[PDB]
Design a binder for this molecule. Sequence first.
Ligand code: NAP
Ligand code: CA
Length: 155
Amino acid sequence: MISLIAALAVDRVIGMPWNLPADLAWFKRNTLNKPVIMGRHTWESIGRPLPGRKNIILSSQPGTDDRVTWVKSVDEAIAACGDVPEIMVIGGGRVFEQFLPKAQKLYLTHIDAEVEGDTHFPDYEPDDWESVFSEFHDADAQNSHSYCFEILERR
Ligand SMILES: NC(=O)c1ccc[n+]([C@@H]2O[C@H](COP(=O)([O-])OP(=O)(O)OC[C@H]3O[C@@H](n4cnc5c(N)ncnc54)[C@H](OP(=O)(O)O)[C@@H]3O)[C@@H](O)[C@H]2O)c1
Ligand SMILES: [Ca+2]
């Protein structure tokens, strides 16, 4: 099954005006040993394959890096994962919009930061997604903002 994972600021802004090592531990635990699907802009932003994971990059043009697996469509990305329990889509905004209708699980980090960004998470509605887990953490000496881990399953 497909799951989206992302860190959302106010107004669902994504993509780094914060410094959250605790969110990176949450991201690493939830994606480790699972294939990750990302768009090309996300891929160039990270700049390196996420270790311990099959990296699948969506792009309409031929691949330019043999360290990862390149695909040209959503169906081809899903097929490139094979038979795995859970597929993790990690961004960006354009890729999230295509995978939201097919996802059954949302891993969200709600960051209490006002950021004027030009990329947003899709507008998921409460009647389609039911919160099954929530965990707030205050801002501390290592995390620049307060944040809230949430897991939503399709109701
Ligand atoms: N390093 C960077 O380039 C970079 C990093 C961060 C942000 N930005 C900017 O910030 C904005 C954020 O964009 P984003 O986060 O929404 O990007 P994204 O989802 O991470 O990547 C979108 C790209 O993925 C490819 N793609 C997505 N779906 C596809 C499909 N079904 N079939 C084939 N290819 C597909 C396309 O690349 P192709 O163009 O190859 O088709 C598309 O341009 C972008 O407008 C960008 O200009 C750029
Ligand atoms: Ca709806």
